[PDB]
Paper text:
In mammals, the most abundant and best-studied NDPKs are NME1 and NME2 (hereafter abbreviated NME1/2), which are closely related isoforms (88% sequence identity) with similar functional attributes and localization in the cytosol and nucleus.
Efforts to cocrystallize murine NME1 with the ligands led to high-resolution (1.96 and 2.2 Å, respectively) crystal structures of NME1 bound to SucCoA and ADP, and a somewhat lower (2.6 Å)–resolution structure bound to CoA. Consequently, the acyl-bearing end of CoA remains solvent accessible when bound to NME1 and potentially free to interact with other protein partners, consistent with our findings that NME1 binds similarly to acylated and non-acylated CoA. Incubating NME1 with either AcCoA or SucCoA yielded similar spectra, revealing that NME1 does not strongly discriminate between these ligands and CoA.
Residue numbers in the entry:
A (entry chain C): 0 to 152
B (entry chain A), D (entry chain F), E (entry chain D): 1 to 152
C (entry chain B): -1 to 152
F (entry chain E): -2 to 152
The structure:
């Protein structure tokens, strides 16, 4: 119930993996001071993706999104820290890469909406839902970062 | 074809002198834009008076043409979806004082007369600046191996 | 080239900045921006120094915990010089509150919480002159001409 | 094929703690090797004793297992021509004292007990370590978009 | 003048395709070498066949030319003290298997047929390769603002 | 505290060409990311007398007078770094004294070219390092603290 232990779901999409951005993206979260809790590599099924993007069932791009997210492996991640959901999105940049600012992950590394390299949860509620959807509870590891007292007061 | 749009980017003589050529090209590559043209030359004053012809009546114009002739520049053509507008965002505000950190100008320079880089401000200007600095046979068209992961 | 280009600001890397190994990365950003380094030292600031440094915050509820924490480890104190370096230096640092710091800034990229914002920079020219005189003796500020001066300033 | 060789790379608990996961993964990506498996776990002691089974009688074995159990690791499988041998070169000498600048250990660590990373020393060891740390359901095979530009 | 030695560096089609152009130029800039020529082109097969004329009897020659012609390349001239020999050191062993981490091929490529870059092996070869790839009009000479901090 | 070998110190000086070419942050970052601990740091124009004492073993060599004049000609970053075998490993990190022999990935291998502009100096021995540290720094300028990752750097 601690603010500093909030968690978010970050997924590196198949274009991110294919273009070699996995380390660069993870690096950005480490240097910010957030803590890695969950990490895995899989080719997501369409049933998983249909559940993940369930709020978009009725959008013309939903079919192409589900099937594109299936077309290659993704990196699934859970990161933990104070306001990690909100600050994650800031670090990611705007969902539509056209408006992402240089310095953000999307603003620095991608161009088009169908190919926006990354996803991050839009709310603490979406996060807990997405974490449970992609991770099993035993796949989430907690540890104390040696630099915790220098990240948090 | 929206994905084939081109913009002219020029690394100005201070950008070449301060060692920023690779860093600037690296940013356009890692963004996903595709290099089409690349040369290194000391631009002539006639070329520069035509490049900055809209500034002909401004009090800084003669100094701009003269300074831009004082060293070699790196002339580039980049291709991609909305590469003109997005390229300008990557460059930062023309005035380095208002450039945001993360942009080329925000990270790498300070003052307006030494703003290290230029990019076309419109599709119409890009087409003119490309034809002004590059000959058609100097612009190379190839398919990036990541084309299907950059564009849907 | 002008003496407006001689403006100076005080930048201090806080104990969290030193502990988390950001000293080089921070100095790099000022170097690659074109600012010139004028003073650089490494010390554990005394409480008298810190209280005088944050004299304007003497009546703030976080003052005692700010002064003790800044004393709890060593800091890197720097003086940088350049046109509008005070204002531009605050832009590079990002918002004082890390939550509002944009990506691309020092705080937006490297820290999370207000008590641990890794870096301080003078907020005005008057603050800078008072802070530089507070942390650096005149003999510890070195002036030299950058080989790139003529390509940074017109 | 030869280009489908695989090695097991594990980022030890000190590399996770010191914020090295991204940097390490970047070096394998930019080298051109392909990521096949990736997980984050706290290895059990039983797994670690089988992983280091050739060291049962070394005076550091018990402390090595205990240290490798003290915190989570990142476990990885990478694929490519000679990834086992080249992987070890990238890592640097097992003892960081001897690792050259430019390697992971040469750049990032100091002491043998805290050498941030492990990589299989042979194709035999790799296959054994991959089977030990990964199940078939965790190994993803995809075709990199740059394959024909990394390989003949 | 010894500090005026020049070498020819070519970023091969795989280096362009995998987005390494900026990273490579950066390494030469930060070392303190000076860019003298820079161009982007698709090399004709006649040019490539003369460039590699010493290799025409090797079994790999036909496929080397095809690979070197399969996409555009970035051709470059770089000037500095012992730039021919030191460029090779920076590039790494021609065979990427032998290249050390910290070199260009050591950090970025794997296989002999896709080794991302070429540098002249001698001053004599350099003068030949430069004349072959660059016309006199395409070379620039300027004083680097750091020359006196690079060279006593 | 740890074993006393973990507390060895070396003197590192970023020369005027290191400062002029914008390498200060890059150099410090390599020492930080390697695990070593920063113990002293100052910016100054060293007097020729200081430099003649620093290089006293070279006082009769043909390059000595110009090396002394050159090192005085602009400001230097003087640092003290602490860690296991930091003297020897620091020298490996810097690369060979002659830049032409310095391998890529080292400080001199990546960033410079010629003998008289080799951007950096590091102590060559423990004994040298004690002498240079005392020459360049007063003891009250050397700061002792515990690195938060010490248990992950040292066994
Ligand atoms: O609140 P948001 O701004 O995040 O909502 P949004 O922009 O409307 O988009 C929500 C999700 O739908 C995706 N999305 C939006 N438009 C899309 C399109 N034309 N094609 C494929 N996917 C699209 C976005 O990537 C995002 O998922 P992601 O979070 O996965 O990007
Ligand atoms: O909309 P814009 O920002 O492009 O218009 P602008 O700010 O008026 O300036 C457009 C071009 O004129 C240049 N420019 C503006 N003021 C200048 C000055 N005092 N000295 C030298 N150049 C100047 C800018 O660098 C820019 O060229 P560049 O695009 O070459 O920077
Ligand atoms: O105008 P500013 O935005 O700089 O003023 P401010 O945000 O109100 O804070 C000014 C100084 O007090 C610090 N400060 C503000 N709130 C704090 C808090 N809750 N706890 C500890 N320190 C705090 C800031 O880090 C800053 O010092 P720093 O400049 O050292 O960050
Ligand atoms: O041929 P190798 O270099 O692999 O053999 P080696 O040098 O004897 O080391 C083999 C493994 O034992 C570890 N190892 C060696 N000496 C150690 C020590 N004093 N303390 C803790 N671990 C030690 C190494 O880090 C390495 O595992 P890792 O591969 O996990 O480093
Ligand atoms: O002395 P060198 O190392 O340059 O001699 P070398 O190893 O025999 O190679 C000389 C040239 O032939 C190329 N080369 C050698 N073997 C090759 C092979 N199996 N396939 C394709 N190219 C090959 C090298 O890339 C190099 O050109 P490059 O310099 O262009 O690599
Ligand atoms: O063992 P070393 O390699 O350090 O001994 P060395 O190469 O003879 O030189 C030791 C010191 O003298 C400097 N030194 C050697 N030859 C020099 C020359 N021709 N010109 C200017 N300085 C020179 C070195 O850079 C070094 O100082 P630095 O340590 O400051 O480089």
């Amino acid at each position: 119930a601690m603010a500093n232990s909030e968690r978010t779901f970050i997924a590196i999409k198949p274009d991110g993996v294919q273009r070699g951005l996995v380390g660069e993206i993870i690096k950005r979260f480490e240097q910010k001071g957030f803590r890695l809790v969950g990490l895995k590599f899989l080719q997501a099924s369409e049933d998983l993706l249909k559940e993940h993007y369930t709020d978009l069932k009725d959008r013309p791009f939903f079919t192409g999104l589900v099937k594109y997210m299936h077309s290659g492996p993704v990196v699934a991640m859970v990161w933990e820290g104070l306001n990690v959901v909100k600050t994650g999105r800031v670090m990611l940049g705007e969902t539509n890469p056209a408006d992402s600012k240089p310095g953000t992950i999307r603003g620095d590394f991608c161009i088009q909406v169908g190919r926006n390299i990354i996803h991050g949860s839009d709310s603490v509620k979406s996060a807990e839902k997405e974490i449970s959807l992609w991770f099993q509870p035993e796949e989430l590891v907690e540890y104390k970062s040696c630099a915790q007292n220098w990240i948090y007061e």
